[PDB]
RNA sequence: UAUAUAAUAGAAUAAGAUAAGUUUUUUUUUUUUUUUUUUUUUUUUUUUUUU
RNA sequence: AAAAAAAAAAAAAAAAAAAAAAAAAAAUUUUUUUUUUUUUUUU
């Protein structure tokens, strides 16, 4: 019989000063959380739309996903039309932690992120790795092997739709690079050259940093694959960086991820 | 589960009766329930349980004082060492109780007959602590009659003014 | 002519009960029996007409 | 004595409606991978 207010005081108070909470203090926030969930779920009909988001993203951040909370993610799912193409990309990720990204979901959630006027990084990691989990949820193995293909050409058509616009986003780090290229390679999804080129010149202005500076970072690996991509790829993205990253694993300025 | 088998609590009502010393606070609770709650009812065991309780009666948890002290009451079958020894210990433990434990417990002392200020004082401070969930218990809506009848409106004014409201 | 220095290693291996946080049609098909209504056929009785 | 028409009773077949009784199956393939921070308030 906890008031309405209340609820979402509390949760906003638990949520805002996660970032950099004490560790000895984390198990009694949980308690917090659990102590009072049932209310949240049979309440579940009467939360703002924007609060639903909150309160979902209060959840995950300890690390905890009830079942008595699964009808707000459903609602979320109807409720679609209205959130920006940032909350649906946030929207995304949450429902992928739900166990409720099916294919359908993922199909209505697409179209949100297109109509961006420009895409930022967010958006397109979030798209990427939806497409390739909605990807893995078909199977051909199984009771309806009539229309696997039917259904990856789908997704492989929206993936290029999604791909073709990929030259308006600025790229933080590498690792979102390395993201977006294995789901381009490990689902064979054609892309213009163009965004290729965008791509590898900030990869290469990026990864001049910490070569020249000679510390702060890159493994050895993620330079393996950068170097086998434009490889397979081909030089003429960049045909500078392939001889930059050729120097510099020659010096050994990458060090090994277990190192 | 709710399922009634006399000849066979026949025996075990008897055994029991022969190992009463053994008993703890949990298996005391478990029988006493179960005998109120099943009809079968020995004179005997019941006043060696009782008994034996009154030495125990330091070592009841939240549960097992409210849930024998309820079954004693239901059954008529009131001890006064028992009485006592149970009623005094309810001010220790009546913060950790919930809404309708504290409603059985009350309406036990009822029948207990102690109307003790040292005792009742933290109980209904509990009552009205949980009140909306006191108040809102069909399966006791009777209950509460017993109790306001046996202390009155000289007792508790506020607790008396919002059973006279309407909810 | 002074009051002060301090550093060596080894092992791979499993126990087991805390009085807890749902409930939102009920229905379809097949078979048997009884009752009611309609249609068709056969038998009996009565009335009318013709030979 | 024969034929036709009408009414009543009995038997059989078909259709519709109501009530009562009985029966309904199963074969391990479910899901994972963000740097996300947008509730609002006089506690």
Redesign the pocket.
């Given at each position: 019989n906890i008031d309405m207010?209340s609820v979402?005081?509390f949760?906003?108070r638990l949520?805002?000063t996660?970032?950099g909470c004490a560790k000895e203090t984390l198990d009694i926030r949980r308690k917090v959380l659990?102590?009072?969930?049932?209310?949240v779920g049979v309440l579940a009909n009467d939360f703002?739309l924007?609060?639903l988001?909150?309160?979902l993203?209060?959840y995950?951040?300890h690390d905890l996903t009830?079942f008595?909370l699964e009808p707000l993610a459903i609602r979320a799912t109807n409720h679609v039309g209205d959130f920006?193409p940032?909350?649906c990309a946030?929207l995304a990720?949450?429902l992928?932690?739900w166990?409720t990204?099916r294919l359908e979901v993922c199909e209505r959630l697409v179209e949100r992120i297109c109509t961006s006027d420009q895409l930022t990084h967010?958006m397109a990691?979030a798209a990427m790795?939806a497409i390739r989990?909605c990807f893995?949820?078909v199977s051909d193995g199984g009771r309806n092997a009539m229309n696997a293909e039917p259904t990856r050409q789908k997704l492989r058509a929206m993936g290029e739709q999604i791909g073709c616009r990929l030259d308006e986003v600025e790229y933080?780090?590498l690792?979102?690079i390395l993201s977006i290229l294995d789901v381009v390679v490990t689902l064979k999804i054609y892309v213009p050259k163009k965004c290729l080129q965008v791509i590898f010149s900030q990869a290469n202005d990026m990864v001049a940093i910490v070569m020249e500076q000679k510390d702060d970072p890159i493994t050895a690996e993620e330079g393996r694959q950068l170097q086998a991509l434009l490889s397979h790829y081909g030089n003429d993205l960049a045909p500078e960086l392939s001889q930059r990253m050729k120097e510099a694993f020659r010096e050994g300025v990458l060090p090994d991820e277990a190192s | 589960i709710g399922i009634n088998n006399p000849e066979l609590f026949d025996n075990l009502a008897e055994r029991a009766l022969a190992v009463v010393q053994d008993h703890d606070?949990?298996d005391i609770?478990?029988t006493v329930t179960a005998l109120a709650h099943f009809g079968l009812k020995d004179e005997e065991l019941f006043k060696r349980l009782a008994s034996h309780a009154a030495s125990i009666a330091d070592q009841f948890?939240a549960?097992?004082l409210v849930?024998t002290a309820h079954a004693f009451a239901r059954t008529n079958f009131l001890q006064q060492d028992m009485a006592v020894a149970l009623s005094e210990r309810s001010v220790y433990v009546c913060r950790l109780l919930d809404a309708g434990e504290t409603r059985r417990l009350l309406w036990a002392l009822a029948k207990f007959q102690v109307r003790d200020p040292k005792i009742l004082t933290p109980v209904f401070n509990r009552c009205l602590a949980l009140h909306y969930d006191f108040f809102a218990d069909p399966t006791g809506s009777e209950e509460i009659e017993e109790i306001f009848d046996f202390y009155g409106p000289n007792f508790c004014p506020p607790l008396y003014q919002l059973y006279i409201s309407r909810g």
């Open positions: 207010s979402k005081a949760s906003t949520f805002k996660r970032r659990l102590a009072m969930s049932r209310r703002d924007p609060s988001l909150g309160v993203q209060c995950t951040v009830p008595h920006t940032h909350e946030t990720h949450v992928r932690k166990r990204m967010h990691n790795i989990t893995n949820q933080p780090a690792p979102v | 606070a949990r609770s478990k948890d549960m097992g849930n």
